[PDB]
């Protein structure tokens, strides 16, 4: 139950400097690892516009409560138009004082990120691609429950949902062929072929998986604390111009 709100960052910045000012303003100590991660480590990427620099600003405090526990997962790239962004969870006041420090010190522009429909489709595509240590991408499956909430005259059709079980999802994926994108090449053409409801134009609200994640239009609710690399890669790719 870690609702990940998302905010934008205007200018590319390093984080190794100025962190002592945050320590002096906060009277705490935080660890900021520098993970130079790279998406689809399979060699069909060219090693260009595929790498990112992740700054997991943890707060190594007493973990007796999860609502006061708040990570700060960052991302960046020195090649795109908007280079960086962050995402924060929890309900601490330290989130407010650290966004105060980020607005005050480096002089950047913050704004919340609203989600599209194809962005939510790509996030549901990327939140199931699991990375193992043997340099390959194994794909788990979840009984996904899509959602819609349109507005009609006199509240005719309030809300309606499309639920797909796990074995059916795996059958559609194995029947489409071998690809790393199931939820944009197999299921959505199947729903368009058998129902005619194009889910790219219908108003999405909550692409919900089987207790694993819960992708929304304003936030992402998960079950574990960590967020995967492809998820933040798709989010950073989405907010470009």
């Amino acid at each position: 139950p870690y609702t990940w709100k998302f905010l934008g960052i205007s200018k590319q910045l390093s984080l190794e400097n100025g962190i002592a000012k945050l320590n002096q303003l906060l009277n705490l100590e935080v660890d900021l690892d520098i993970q130079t991660i790279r998406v689809p480590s399979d060699p069909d990427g060219g090693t260009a516009a595929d790498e990112y620099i992740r700054y997991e600003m943890r707060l190594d405090i007493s973990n007796l409560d999860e609502g006061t526990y708040s990570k700060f997962i960052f991302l960046g790239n020195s090649k795109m138009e908007v280079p960086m962004f962050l995402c924060y969870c929890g309900t601490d006041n330290r989130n407010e004082v650290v966004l105060q420090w980020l607005k005050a010190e480096y002089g950047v522009i913050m704004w919340p990120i609203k989600f599209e429909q194809k962005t939510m489709i790509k996030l549901a595509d990327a939140s199931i691609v699991h990375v193992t240590k043997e340099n390959i991408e194994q794909i788990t499956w979840f009984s996904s429950k899509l959602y819609f909430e349109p507005e009609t005259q006199d509240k005719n059709l309030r809300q309606f949902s499309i639920e797909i079980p796990r074995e059916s999802c795996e059958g559609l994926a194995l029947g489409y062929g071998n690809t790393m994108h199931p939820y944009n090449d197999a299921i959505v053409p199947y729903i368009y072929n058998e129902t005619g409801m194009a889910v790219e134009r219908l108003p999405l609200t909550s692409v919900i998986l089987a207790g694993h994640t819960k992708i929304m239009r304003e936030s992402i609710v998960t079950s574990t604390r960590s967020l995967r690399n492809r998820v933040l890669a798709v989010v950073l790719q989405s907010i470009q111009f």
């Binding site: 934008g8 205007s10 200018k11 607005k103 005050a104 010190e105 002089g107 950047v108 522009i109 913050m110 704004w111 990120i113 609203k114 907010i239 111009f241």
Partner: protein, 362 residues
């Protein structure tokens, strides 16, 4: 301070923050509110913001001055690629950034302005009825309004005015069959700017094809602004010699305009055999239509009929025979009442009294 997002967000001095940072910078290049302005404009264009109305007037008010930020905004925004994103917000920012610009960097931006005006024209024709293209013509004409106020950038202004007027006079935008008044409003604005130039470079003549097209339209506001321009260039051309066939061209213009107007009898851009061909195709009555304007004459005739107790053609002569006491003089009285008052369509009466000396004593 350094938090720019809380400074110009929207303290008695809170209205004066950006000027303080700009004088504390010694500017010359990319400051902090410059980056905030361009970033908020990009965020408003890419639809990444919920409400652009809480940001856009702040952008306009901080960017109405500061010519370098305005030049960078017009240099890196006025293109088709940001035109195809959102035409409303582009309309707002070009209404806010253009009439206060007055560029003096290179003074070679003629090709850039005609390229932008051609690109927005190609996009407004690619929709085909957009009611959008004439708004930026109004704004670029209000920037022509301040370009001619200084001694600098006047030749560029007049050649851009000629290019804009020749581009605004296509029948895809305005025509008497099925069109609007937006191009007419932009054209009367440009003609008013021409009057303000002529009242105080041998290119004041707008060219005879545009002259016959602005005379040929049945738009009364456009015709009143046209004859206003004609009396203005009469006042500017009276102190010029009658050689080189341009003063004679202006005489031909006012002669053709009087041929459309009260004076009868001829080459009004086309042979009178073509007039006889049309009048033999559709149809005493050969000259019963020589001068939607006559509804205003009938309405103002009913208005002046209030001071007394109680389709100008030969039927009006029959109605006069049914019971001043003429038909040839009621038009002169209508022109006199349009002359003396401060009601609009004043310039047609001003032209009819400043020319055609046999009727100037009315």
């Amino acid at each position: 301070n350094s938090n720019v997002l809380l400074p110009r967000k929207v303290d008695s001095l809170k209205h004066l923050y950006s000027s303080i940072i700009l004088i504390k910078n010694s500017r010359d290049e990319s400051s902090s509110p410059y980056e905030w302005c361009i970033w908020q404009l990009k965020r408003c264009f890419a639809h990444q913001i919920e409400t652009p109305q809480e940001v856009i007037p702040i952008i306009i008010s901080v960017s109405s001055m500061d010519n370098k930020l305005s030049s960078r905004i017009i240099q890196t925004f006025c293109n088709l690629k940001y035109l195809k994103l959102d035409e409303l917000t582009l309309k707002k920012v070009c209404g806010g950034i253009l009439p206060l610009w007055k560029p003096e960097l290179i003074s070679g931006t003629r090709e850039f302005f005609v390229k932008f005006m051609a690109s927005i024209f190609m996009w407004s024709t690619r929709d085909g009825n957009n009611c959008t293209f004439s708004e930026t013509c109004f704004y670029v004409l209000q920037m022509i309004t301040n370009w001619v106020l200084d001694d600098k950038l006047i030749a560029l202004g007049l050649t851009l005015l000629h290019d804009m007027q020749s581009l605004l006079t296509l029948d895809k935008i305005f025509n008497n069959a099925t069109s609007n008044r937006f191009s007419t409003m932009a054209f009367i604005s440009s003609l008013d700017i021409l009057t303000q130039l002529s009242k105080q470079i041998q290119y004041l003549i707008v060219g005879p094809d545009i002259m016959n097209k602005v005379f040929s339209s049945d738009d009364p506001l456009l015709l009143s602004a046209a004859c206003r321009y004609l009396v203005a260039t009469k006042n500017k051309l009276m102190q010029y010699p009658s050689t080189n066939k341009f003063v004679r061209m202006q005489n031909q213009y006012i002669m053709d305009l009087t041929n459309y107007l009260y004076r009868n009898k001829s080459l009004f851009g086309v042979s009178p055999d073509f007039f006889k061909q049309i009048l033999e195709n559709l149809y005493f009555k050969n000259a019963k239509f020589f001068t939607a304007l006559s509804y205003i004459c009938i309405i103002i005739l009913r208005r002046l009929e209030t001071a007394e107790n109680t389709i100008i053609n030969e039927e009006t002569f029959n109605n006069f025979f049914r019971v001043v006491n003429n038909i040839h003089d009621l038009r002169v009285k209508i022109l006199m009442h349009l002359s003396n008052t401060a009601n609009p369509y004043r310039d047609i009466a001003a032209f009819l009294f400043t020319y055609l000396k046999s009727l100037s004593k009315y």
